[PDB]
Design a protein around this ligand. Structure first.
Ligand code: MG
Ligand code: MG
Ligand code: MG
Ligand code: MG
Ligand code: MG
Ligand code: MG
Ligand code: MG
Ligand code: MG
Ligand code: MG
Ligand code: MG
Ligand code: MG
Ligand code: MG
Ligand code: MG
Ligand code: MG
Ligand code: MG
Ligand code: MG
Ligand code: MG
Ligand code: MG
Lengths: 150, 234, 138
RNA sequence: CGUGUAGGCGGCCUGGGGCGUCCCAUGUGAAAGACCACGGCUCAACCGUGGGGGAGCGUGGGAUACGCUCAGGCUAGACG
RNA sequence: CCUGGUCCACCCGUGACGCUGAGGCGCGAAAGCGUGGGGAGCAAACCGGAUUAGAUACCCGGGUAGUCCACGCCCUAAACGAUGCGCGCUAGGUCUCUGGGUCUCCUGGGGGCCGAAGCUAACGCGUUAAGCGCGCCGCCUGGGGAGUACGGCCGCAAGGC
């Protein structure tokens, strides 16, 4: 049980002798707002159902977003697919400036001070997957020199 | 007493169909065959048991798997003889990953297990008799060792991992520590606890599966003579 | 014939780690040692020693990587996740002192040759100098 | 598709110069505008004072890793 | 007979003499052009015969340039790996061509298939990279208009840049 807010929903379609069957897609983000979030994509014969599955998957796949003042440890860039995403931390008291997808995700992740920017393909779905793998790649001075032991 | 046994007729296997990853566990190539270093195989057997033993003496269940004929039965024994689940037939997909659905078919095995000895058989036209019998037959046929614990095993032991890597994926995707008996036909890396050795000659499987099932019970009491192995063994 | 032996070196390493590996051997150089000295001294490797492969001096450079991981693809994290050269042989990239970059928010290193030896983002900022920003590592 | 002119690009070691490059000092970089403070008109816009910055470029001094140049050597590229 | 490139072995010689390359220069399939030979077969064009609503076509019987040679032009292409060249670096497996060795084996160049890692929009690529890097050249910037117009340069013309 977390925040749970859905990014986008879409109706797709497939062809078959006699007309077009359909299906609906739901992208959903999930967070407690402490540094826990998860992305979930769910497709099914109907709107209600799809959204449900979304949430279920969302929880299945969550990431430890390590804040450092309600912002972020370091600046990162990540390409997933044809879609590039830039993450730059802001000084406390700024706001979370981003487009639907990146914002969405980042709110529940409990950020409050972040500069973004979608580049390349601005496909929601892939910007999603993009942002995750960015957060998923966040390091603090700790876990850093934690690897520079020896 | 260890080095003598294995090196007796239980090492050196797959040749030139190898896998360069598994090379830190090789000595050389005799007659064309890859001959695996046992000296290191020991230092790994050690740690592999260091795990089994720190699990058997903490009461956690292990799932043995081998679906290749040269190592089917020899695992049907060792398992019952340790009271542990196993999969002798075709390791159905999604067993662990989809544990809530493969289990819905074990709750159907007994649904026929308790309509087996019953007064309801008096009726039911011969149609449903051949049917529910057969259904039972096969249900049984595949789930002989897959009832026991209705709960994700805290580990998994396996013969040839690359022969049944499907399983290893399920386990790995769930986070289930993996232990297995890989040769040069397999890739180390994706196995948490490694038993480098022969994996086709029914010899080496016995010598390793036995002492493993033995070290299982050595953390419970009941030290005995090994299990039924020789019958047509060569 | 190699144009920038350094960008090479670094690439040798970038490729080395990708599959993880005891060591990799850049051909020797009194500047490549220099550069390397700051990798180890800042903890990106175990180190390096001289060697040879038939009259030819090299540098055995012993890498460093993270702790084995859980779940699918259990390959370790990387000590060096990213190493890309700044100043290139086709565009020398010089920097005054107040211009010096701040790699990854202190988490990384900006090795860079100077009028008084190969320093770094912190090291030079202190000694108060600048020079050919050699590369960024993290 | 080749061959090659100019041009761009240049392997290992040692030293000389210090042209690029880096640092410090100083001249210059008007004022107005901008930007931080403070007040002046009832606030504000406008407006005053004060401070702080400005790349560049000249002058003097210094460093010598990398680039350049002159010099001495090597054989891993290249050629025979 | 004359001549180019290219790989191997010995570690002998010079001692960085290298890489790329705007312009230039050379080469450049087929068709096409000029001058002069040559002509069996094939064959644009063209003539016939069928088919066909028609059949300037597909199928059949003929047939001229051309296809060939010498010398000179033309300089285009699905000139295709639709993949510029050079160097270093990043698992192996399989068969194949051709070198060398105290030759069931190892090593060196070349040509194929499957494929780690990694790339990729995907298809696929993968030590013959579309991987990871440096150098240098060429090129792209929505479709049609249009490789057209004008100008310029080259060409006997066709036409080319
Ligand atoms: Mg891209
Ligand atoms: Mg030149
Ligand atoms: Mg002023
Ligand atoms: Mg000499
Ligand atoms: Mg050339
Ligand atoms: Mg012709
Ligand atoms: Mg003619
Ligand atoms: Mg005809
Ligand atoms: Mg004819
Ligand atoms: Mg021609
Ligand atoms: Mg072709
Ligand atoms: Mg080859
Ligand atoms: Mg392939
Ligand atoms: Mg190969
Ligand atoms: Mg237009
Ligand atoms: Mg056009
Ligand atoms: Mg044209
Ligand atoms: Mg014209």
């Amino acid at each position: 049980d977390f925040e749970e807010k859905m990014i986008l929903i879409r109706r797709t379609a497939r062809m078959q002798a006699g007309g077009r069957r359909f299906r609906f897609g739901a992208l959903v983000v999930v967070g407690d707002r402490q540094g826990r979030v998860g992305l979930g994509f769910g497709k099914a014969p109907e709107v209600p159902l799809a959204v449900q599955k979304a949430g279920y998957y969302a929880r299945r796949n969550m990431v430890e977003v390590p804040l450092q003042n309600g912002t972020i440890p370091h600046e990162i860039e990540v390409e997933f697919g044809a879609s590039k995403i830039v993450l730059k931390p802001a000084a406390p008291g700024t706001g979370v400036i981003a487009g639907a997808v990146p914002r969405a995700i980042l709110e529940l992740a409990g950020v409050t001070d972040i500069l973004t920017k979608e580049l390349g393909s601005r496909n929601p779905i892939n910007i999603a997957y993009a942002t995750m793998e960015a957060l998923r790649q966040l390091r603090t001075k700790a876990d850093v020199e934690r690897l520079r032991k020896g | 007493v260890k080095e003598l046994l294995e090196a007796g007729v239980h090492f050196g296997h797959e040749r030139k169909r190898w896998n360069p990853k598994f090379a830190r566990y090789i000595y050389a190539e005799r007659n064309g065959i890859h001959i695996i270093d046992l000296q290191k195989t020991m230092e790994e057997l050690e740690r592999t048991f260091r795990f089994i033993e720190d699990l058997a003496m903490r009461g956690g269940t292990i799932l043995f798997v081998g679906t290749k004929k040269q190592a089917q039965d020899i695992v049907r024994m060792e398992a019952e003889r340790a009271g542990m689940p196993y999969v002798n037939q075709r390791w159905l997909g999604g067993m662990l990953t989809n544990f809530k659905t493969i289990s819905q078919r074990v709750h159907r095995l007994e649904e026929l297990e308790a309509l087996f000895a019953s007064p309801e058989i008096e009726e039911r036209p011969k149609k449903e008799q051949v049917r529910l019998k057969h259904e039972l037959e096969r249900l049984q046929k595949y789930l002989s060792g897959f009832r026991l614990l209705k709960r994700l095993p805290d580990a998994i032991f396996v013969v040839d991992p690359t022969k049944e890597a499907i399983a290893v994926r399920e386990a790995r995707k769930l986070f289930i520590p993996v232990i297995a008996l890989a040769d040069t036909d397999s890739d180390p890396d994706l196995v948490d606890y490694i038993i480098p050795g022969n994996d086709d000659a029914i010899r080496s499987i016995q010598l390793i599966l036995s002492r493993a099932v033995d070290l299982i019970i050595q953390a419970r009491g009941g030290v005995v003579e090994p299990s039924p192995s020789y019958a047509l063994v060569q | 014939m190699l144009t920038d032996p350094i960008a090479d070196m670094l690439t040798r390493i970038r490729n080395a780690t990708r599959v993880y590996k005891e060591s990799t051997d850049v051909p020797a150089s009194r500047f490549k040692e220099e550069i390397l000295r700051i990798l180890a001294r800042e903890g990106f490797i175990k180190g390096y020693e001289r060697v040879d492969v038939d009259g030819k001096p090299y540098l055995r450079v012993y890498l460093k990587y993270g702790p084995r991981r859980q779940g699918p693809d259990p390959r370790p994290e990387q000590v060096i996740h990213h190493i890309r050269r700044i100043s290139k042989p086709g565009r020398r990239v010089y920097v005054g002192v107040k211009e010096i970059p701040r790699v990854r928010r202190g988490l990384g290193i900006a090795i860079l040759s100077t009028s008084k030896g190969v320093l770094t983002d912190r090291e030079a900022r202190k000694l108060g100098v600048g020079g050919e920003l050699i590369c960024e590592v993290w």
